[PDB]
Amino acid sequence: ISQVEAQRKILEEAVSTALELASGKSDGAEVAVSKTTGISVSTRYGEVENVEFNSDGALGITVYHQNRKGSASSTDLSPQAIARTVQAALDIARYTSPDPCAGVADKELLAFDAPDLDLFHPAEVSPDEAIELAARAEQAALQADKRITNTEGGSFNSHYGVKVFGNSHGMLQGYCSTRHSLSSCVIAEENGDMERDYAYTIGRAMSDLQTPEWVGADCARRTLSRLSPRKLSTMKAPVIFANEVATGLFGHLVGAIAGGSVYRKSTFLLDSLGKQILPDWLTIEEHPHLLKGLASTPFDSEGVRTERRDIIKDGILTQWLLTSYSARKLGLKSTGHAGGIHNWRIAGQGLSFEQMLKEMGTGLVVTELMGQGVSAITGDYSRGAAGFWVENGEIQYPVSEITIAGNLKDMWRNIVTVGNDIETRSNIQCGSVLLPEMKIAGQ
Amino acid sequence: SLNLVSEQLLAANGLKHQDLFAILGQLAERRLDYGDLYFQSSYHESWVLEDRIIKDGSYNIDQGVGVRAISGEKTGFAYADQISLLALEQSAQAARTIVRDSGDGKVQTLGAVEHSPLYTSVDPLQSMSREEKLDILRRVDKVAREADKRVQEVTASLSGVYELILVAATDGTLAADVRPLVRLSVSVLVEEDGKRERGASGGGGRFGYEFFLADLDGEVRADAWAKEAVRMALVNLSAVAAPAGTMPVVLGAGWPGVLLHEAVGHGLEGDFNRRGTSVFSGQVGELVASELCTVVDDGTMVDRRGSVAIDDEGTPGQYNVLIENGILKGYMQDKLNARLMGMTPTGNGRRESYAHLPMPRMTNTYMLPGKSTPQEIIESVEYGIYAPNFGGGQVDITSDKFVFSTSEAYLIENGKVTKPVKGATLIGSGIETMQQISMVGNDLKLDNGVGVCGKEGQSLPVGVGQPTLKVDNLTVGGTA
Amino acid sequence: DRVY
Ligand code: NA
Ligand code: NA
Ligand SMILES: [Zn+2]
């Protein structure tokens, strides 16, 4: 923490300088600064490919006067650059129109004394040490099977950051964090067909990562499993979203219950507050204060406290995800969701992935999705898919060049079960999800 | 122009030509094929109208230097968010550690050459008054709302960027660009009997905001686009379930050229082909598309969003024929991949900023026109889809599977466009889909200036285009 | 990474 504590002092001082410069000319102001430092390396066939040294800084300010707002940003944190940034935002706010829902977050909601969530676990990893980790992962994948005929490389990333937020109610709080990750991606071939897949490990501390050999083995297993797929014929069938894409299935809920969509009437869940939109046994728990959590945060991007909440409780939508502005539009208070969600947890209902395959019997497992294809305002869903066909409760062959289609309201309401095979590397964490039917387009 | 950029990026930051020599010399202490210094400064402004008011505005500044050291496959890279001698020294000293071995030190003398100008050097942010910029947004709001009583909400935004770049390299390259970019975006919400839908329009290019007030087929462009967003929203509001399965699809001209961007364009980027990870690797001279198809990547188009007067390596933008009468001709390159493939730069070495590595990337990717009329194409289909507008797409270049998702689509029944259908993701294999193109229209156009391309986390402005065309069999992700 |  020598270099990091020096950066942190510089950042705290930049926030205080920006706020003081703004204070005589605005009714309110918000300032955010960050610094991120680290290394990104790659390997090809076990040899160093790229070595990138990362060093990024940023200052952003929003000012308010007469309910008019203006924003400016700079990557230069010199006193003169900060002065120019503050002036630029002030100048904008002379010309924007009054909008009473704009402004600094309510003082009563601010994290003046923010909790320490233990997000910072630095490692002095040299470029050569990083390269060897990446090479180990890639090599382990490449040696798994003679059908692995090419590579997209090994990769290792290690970064530390400092974030400081302040506003004109007198909040000034900052925190440090780290993220480390290790991955590999290889290519297999059979009968003129090439496939690519990847594996990874991620964590806040280096000692929370899987081994390079684990990553390689998982990369090879996934890649080889894709070989010689079939294009299904057009049909209706049950669908399991494997854990890795099931998280994203729940992820569509975020936009659907975002306060900005709700006040603008641009969500298909506009009339669903307090209604049962998911099965009555399904609860989505938000845990912003988990120690070392991948998406834990001591305050949101407006400085607002984050809270333990059940967003969905026994299938019922309990709240919107609000920021200061959208809360004000709705006559409510911010829920601390400026900048997004903060660790969602969905418990399994007892079945393993294997048991879920047996329960389904015949149907599609989706493991990868492509395209956007989700309408925020209607819930209509149409995405490209790859995965596996299942018959007799057993995987028969990989599939690809197909789509799955339906509507999120129906999809979510009629979930059959959620598996105990929880994906633990993401913000939203859940197991695989069984839907009773989708329209599969293919041949 | 180089002189003007040099004054702003070098002289104003206490740097001279001889400092470039020193820093390149620091790199060339190691055994390298190439090294470069990349200087950038940029200014971005935005204004947003929503709820009938000028709700928001921003002004964002960035500047920096990026330094690369390259040996064969290998790149060492470091950068700083400031332009100074110390930033350059620190960045070079880090980057060069990619190779321990000493080099001969023999760099090529720096020397600039002329290139064709593709866009103004007049700063778009200062060339129009603030109230005149905001009047573009006000006019969009008024016109959209007047177009139909069902219009309930309008969000209209203006964005502008002014960017200076200079690049100096061990191969003697010394080059600079002045890059303006503006965009007008419009989004509308319609409501009828409790049902709501949205529609969008917009565009721009490399020029000032006056473009948005210029004539487009007898009306003010901004007005035309305001009306288009409403039209799109109303079509969507009326749309019924799309059909599911394999059927003929007729694609409109312009932005439906996303097809080409996904089906061939990434697959023909030289990094994937050098590595052998693209389906197109080793296929030069082979039929990869129907004989009706000639696909180009063209960095030379005056005033266009996707164009590159120089790329980020200082290579002037080029007209590159990728596929000619169905036959694969070659790949888009950056310097690194061109060397490893025994080929030459093509003007496709692009980076998001000084803080990111360049790689082979698209500019404006389009299909040349053919002999069919759009009417003849539609009349050839007994049952299928007509899709004149799209959202985005995605591609797996190894397995050769791609998708793109409609934003406006209709049934074709008995050779006539009929009912509007809901958004659907279309999926195919790239090569196989290109080989299914049986009719190519005489109505080429490019997109309006809306393209963003993503690769390795780096977003870039791009163009796409095509005439109306027919794909005989494509999988449609409807529900019906 | 994904490719758009
Ligand atoms: Na004040
Ligand atoms: Na020229
Ligand atoms: Zn792209």
Residue numbers in the entry:
A (entry chain B): 8 to 450
B (entry chain A): 2 to 481
C (entry chain E): 601 to 604
What does the paper say about this structure?
Using a combination of biochemical and crystallographic methods we show that E. coli TldD and TldE interact to form a heterodimeric metalloprotease. TldD/E cleaves the N-terminal leader sequence from the modified MccB17 precursor peptide, to yield mature antibiotic, while it has no effect on the unmodified peptide. Both proteins are essential for the activity; however, only the TldD subunit forms a novel metal-containing active site within the hollow core of the heterodimer. Peptide substrates are bound in a sequence-independent manner through β sheet interactions with TldD and are likely cleaved via a thermolysin-type mechanism.
Wild-type TldD/E crystals were grown in the presence of the peptide angiotensin II, and customized angiotensin II variant where the central (Tyr-Ile) peptide bond is replaced with a non-cleavable methylene bond, to yield two co-crystal structures with clear density for peptides where the carboxyl group of the C-terminal residue acts as a ligand to the catalytic zinc ion. In the case of angiotensin II, the density was consistent with Asp-Arg-Val-Tyr (hence WT-DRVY), indicative of cleavage at the central peptide bond of angiotensin. Using the standard nomenclature for protease active sites, these two ligands spanned subsites S4-S1 and S3-S1, respectively, occupying roughly half of the active site cleft. WT-DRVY peptide ligand was refined with occupancy of 0.7.
